[PDB]
């Protein structure tokens, strides 16, 4: 016995609920297949949690600077048992949420682990029972990469991001492997709650595929913080101690020797070196579903997998892996099937993103190596600037801005926006607009400055 | 005998200074009048040590969330006189780069008190010296407004912004008069800071000019952080007890009868009810050149004052009293003169501004009833939004943030945006960027979010 829907989405994550809701606002018969928790990674293991865990470590960061603005010191230590069961309420408050959002669109919660079934009409099997409709979206992300045994031994003794979200205390020693996104915000959360942190990175810089200009700035507001940046250094061995972990590293600077060292009585060893798609189980091969080498399913720019009436979208396709791209593309889908919105997709250009390091950084568009390749090295000019913020003018802790502005052509189009800095979270989304709008340098000069603020710099760059 | 440049400007304040580099740089031999400090409002008893005072308030704000964010509590008081001495370094230390500035481009600094004289062709006297140019800029801002003593008997014993920035200890007890910028932030600032503070309004909101929503809210913010907010109250009379001043007030709620309230024991009466232009000992009759009532000076769309030859920016003329508006204008007069560009003036609509309350407020553009004037009930749409940042998921005290999107014709061009919230400030400059371009809610909802943020609510109203 099979029951028909119009729409069935597979994964309660971000991009599957938004396709689901956009879906049932359009009329559709929708159904949501999540196998643990709704709302996903960003919910449980993602987005909100690590932004609670930041604003902590900003507190924390922000309050060495109390006796610097008048007020006596406050010297007693970080509770991480505190805030973890804060973080884990809040966590089950939105859980509540995200299951009234659907009951409130009358969308069917199917509760169970989908794979699809060898049916030429596309089905799906839940805990033994059968679903199809004229439309599936696989929207099931994906999960931590961890190295193999074979070749790290003992790499099952690490961590990722899913068991820090676990930790009930503050690792006294923390060792985070990996130079993205994940390895830069955990270093930066751990050391400023207390942690003694060093972060391994196989090259000399963080974030090497951001403009020069913020992988070079961040690495060094890394150091400046006590995170201890190992420097082309990577694991060979973790074994278990009395005292924690010993990690075997291997460093092999160039223009040097290569050179073995153990590092002892780690508490924590997190391994944040990419992720990659939740498509194993899926039995897309009864359907000659298209997947990489990786297991991403692929599409096209329409979310079309190479399987008529199925569609993949957010982080199990693999590209810009963020949760406002699987919303965005998640909706376009759902007006592209739902009201008939033949162009509706999702544009991957000009996607603006925040890393919540210390302090945070924003950018949005090509970086200058990018934009040289595109447009010429004569046609693309750069406009940047350094500065103190005013907040540390009285602090003897300092923190740097940097913003950098990339021009292509005569009219100084603005292709790209690069900083980092106080407030740089909350500053891009505007600059985004603007961006995707097709701004040019003489747009930015004509907007008046706000005054005092960091963002005016970004006005009056010359 | 009498000393030739091309520009002479009187004032070394925002718009002054600006005027006079940009001037500089495209080759004119110029001099700068002051006869006090350099850097003027902003750097001496504006801008710069308000937001010092503002980011110590916001500092011990977040602080009395430290506990809930996991760290034993930070019980101890807050010393006036350690900011106080940092602040005034910092304002020293800009006061000697503003100078240098000046240097650096050539400019001579003419120290002393500007008037015009009589002579036909527009020449000014500083101590007995006689200065004249073919150009002269007249940028000398404004002042605090105070009662005269024939009204409110007793007004002499109040303070206001100039002599906020003098106090050497944080008053006991505050009474902040008037509902503008000024008595928002310093009653914000001087109630965080730990004064009893009462804030008297001759209405029931602050911010009447603002749009409602952002009166209404900012009325309410300051209520909820202990802000004691007198409304329909006006004061009759002051005078010094032997416990600081007894303030008389008349309160008259319509509806109500009036009454009559004494509240002693006030240390600091502050009064902040506008400002008025430094004009009074100019000598503008030699010249015959025009001022309203008030004493601002008159000027035409490029800045020209009705006298050839002699032109104004800045506060002194009443209009966008911003140092970002000083400094634009200034700036573009200087190409006009100097560059030869005739139509090179500033655009006075779209120009951004933020409260520095608790939180923050932004606005650019419209109000809702502004556009429905301009363009008619049927032709304007708003979208809202207020929610609790994430921010405060895990604290007992709490914040709102409020937004709304103002949108005219068809294609619901952006005429407003109206915001209050943490993180505002940072926030709004590059939202003022695409109004300024003609952005409509369709490109904002082209424009990806960015999360966990604020400042994507803005880009997702439906
Ligand atoms: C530590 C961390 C921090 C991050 N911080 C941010 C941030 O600040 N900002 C940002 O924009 N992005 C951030 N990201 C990225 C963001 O979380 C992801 O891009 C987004 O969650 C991906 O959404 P999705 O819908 O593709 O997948 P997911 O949210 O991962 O949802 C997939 C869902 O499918 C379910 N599922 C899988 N297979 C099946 C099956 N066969 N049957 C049923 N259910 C199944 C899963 O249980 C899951 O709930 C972060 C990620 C991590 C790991
Ligand atoms: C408390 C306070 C807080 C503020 N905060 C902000 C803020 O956060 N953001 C913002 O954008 N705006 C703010 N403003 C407004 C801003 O400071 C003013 O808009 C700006 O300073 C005006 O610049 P100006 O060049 O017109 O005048 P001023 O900076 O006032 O400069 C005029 C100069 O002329 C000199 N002078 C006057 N007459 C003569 C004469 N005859 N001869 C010689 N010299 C003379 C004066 O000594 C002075 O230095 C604030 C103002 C106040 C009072
Ligand atoms: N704020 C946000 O928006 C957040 C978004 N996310 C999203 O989730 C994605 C996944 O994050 P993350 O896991 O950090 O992945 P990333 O791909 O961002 O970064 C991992 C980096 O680690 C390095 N690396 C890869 N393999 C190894 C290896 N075997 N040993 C050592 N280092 C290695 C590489 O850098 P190198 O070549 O220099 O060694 C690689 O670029 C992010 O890219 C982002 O899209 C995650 C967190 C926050
Ligand atoms: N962040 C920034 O950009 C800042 C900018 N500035 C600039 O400086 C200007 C001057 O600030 P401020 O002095 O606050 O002036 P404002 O004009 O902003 O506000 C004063 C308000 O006080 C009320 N008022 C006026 N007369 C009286 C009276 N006799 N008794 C009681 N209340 C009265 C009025 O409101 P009502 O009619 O409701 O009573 C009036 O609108 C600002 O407008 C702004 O342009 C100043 C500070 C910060």
Avoid at 89 to 94: G, P
Avoid at 150 to 162: H, M, R, V
Avoid at 219 to 237: C, D, I, M, P, R
Avoid at 382 to 403: D, E, G, L
Wanted: charged share 20%; hydrophobic share 40%; proline share 4%.
């Amino acid at each position: 016995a099979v029951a028909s829907y119009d729409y069935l989405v597979i994964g309660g994550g971000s991009g599957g609920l938004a396709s689901a809701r956009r879906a049932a606002e359009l009329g559709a018969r929708a159904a949501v297949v999540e196998s643990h928790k709704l709302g996903g990674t960003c919910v449980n293991v993602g987005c909100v949690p690590k932004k609670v865990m930041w604003n902590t470590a900003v507190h924390s960061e922000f309050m060495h600077d109390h006796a610097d603005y008048g007020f006596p010191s406050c010297e007693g230590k970080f509770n991480w048992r505190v805030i973890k069961e804060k973080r884990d309420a809040y966590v089950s408050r939105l859980n509540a949420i995200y299951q009234n959002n659907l009951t409130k669109s009358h969308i069917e919660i199917i509760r169970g682990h989908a794979a699809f079934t060898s049916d030429p009409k596309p089905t799906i099997e839940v805990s033994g029972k059968k679903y199809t409709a004229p439309h599936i979206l696989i929207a099931t992300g994906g999960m931590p990469s961890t190295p193999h045994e074979s070749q790290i031994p003992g790499a099952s003794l690490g961590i990722t991001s899913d068991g820090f979200f676990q930790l009930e205390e503050l690792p006294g020693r923390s060792v985070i492997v990996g130079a993205g996104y994940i390895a830069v915000e955990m270093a930066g959360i751990l050391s400023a709650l207390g942690s003694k942190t060093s972060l391994m990175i196989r090259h000399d810089k963080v974030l090497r595929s951001f403009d020069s200009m913020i992988s070079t700035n961040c690495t060094e507001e890394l150091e400046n913080a006590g995170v201890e940046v190992l420097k082309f250094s990577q694991v060979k061995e973790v074994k278990k101690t009395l005292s924690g972990l010993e990690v075997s590293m291997v460093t092999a600077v160039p223009g040097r020797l290569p050179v073995m060292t153990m590092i002892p009585d780690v508490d924590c060893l997190l391994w944040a070196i990419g992720r990659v798609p939740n498509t194993k189980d899926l039995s897309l091969n009864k359907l000659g579903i298209q997947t990489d080498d990786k297991g991403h399913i692929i599409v096209d720019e329409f979310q079309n997998t190479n399987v008529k009436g199925i569609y993949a979208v957010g982080d199990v396709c693999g590209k810009a892996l963020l949760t406002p791209v699987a919303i965005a593309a998640g909706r376009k889908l759902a007006h592209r099937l739902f009201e008939y919105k033949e162009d509706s997709k999702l544009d991957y250009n000009n996607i603006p993103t925040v890393v919540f390091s210390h302090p945070p950084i924003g950018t949005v568009g090509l970086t200058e190596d990018e934009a040289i390749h595109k447009y010429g090295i004569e046609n693309v000019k750069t406009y940047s600037t350094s500065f103190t913020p005013m907040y540390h003018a009285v602090t003897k802790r300092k923190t740097k801005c940097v913003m950098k502005m990339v021009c292509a052509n005569k009219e100084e189009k603005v292709v790209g926006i690069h900083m980092q800095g106080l407030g740089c979270d909350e500053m891009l989304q505007g600059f985004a607009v603007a961006v995707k709008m097709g701004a040019t340098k003489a747009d930015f000069d004509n907007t008046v400055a706000i005054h005092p603020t960091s963002s005016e710099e970004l006005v009056t760059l010359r």
